[PDB]
Paper text:
[name] is the major [name] of the type IV pili (TFP) system in this clinically important Gram-positive bacterium. TFP are the most widespread type of pili, and are uniquely found in both Gram-positive and Gram-negative species. [name] is thought to assemble into long pili filaments, which are decorated by the minor pilins.
We use the structure determination of the major [name] in type IV pili (TFP), [name], from [name] as a working example. Previous knowledge of the biology and structure of TFP pilins, particularly the presence of a long, N-terminal α-helix required for pilus formation, allowed informed decisions to be made during the structure-determination strategy. The [name] structure was finally successfully determined using ARCIMBOLDO and the ab initio MR strategy used is described. ARCIMBOLDO uses a fragment-based method and harnesses the predicted secondary structure of the target sequence to place fragments as search models, in combination with powerful density-modification algorithms such as those implemented in SHELXE, to provide an initial trace model. As our example shows, using a careful approach to molecular-replacement pipelines and exploring available options, combined with prior knowledge of both the biology and structural characteristics of the protein of interest, can lead to solution of the phase problem and the determination of novel protein structures.
Numbering used by the authors: 8 to 140
Amino acid sequence: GSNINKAKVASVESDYSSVKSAALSYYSDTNKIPVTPDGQTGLSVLETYMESLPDKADIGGKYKLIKVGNKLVLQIGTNDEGVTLTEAQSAKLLSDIGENKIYTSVTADNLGNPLTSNTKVDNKVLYIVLIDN
């Protein structure tokens, strides 16, 4: 329960850090935000920059990269499966990553409701800002 759940959150944080470094490299080299091709999932857009591509989050859900306004966003989950978070998992993720990054909804233009330290997520797609311009 408690310790396993905290380590699943830490695993997403490690994936986030690795993907963020690779994304910044791609952005510096191409002058364009790396995005998953329309109609696909996964991080193969970053394959030149990563020895091993993260596939699924330990909290549930496949990874992909989307543009939301001017921001690069790590999407965690798809139609098939979203993330699951207890309040304690949400609290750790926010303590470690900080504010204005983790969202429970987006449109193509705008970040939606921010995750809070009291939020439970039951099989829903989650969003973490990687690059804020």
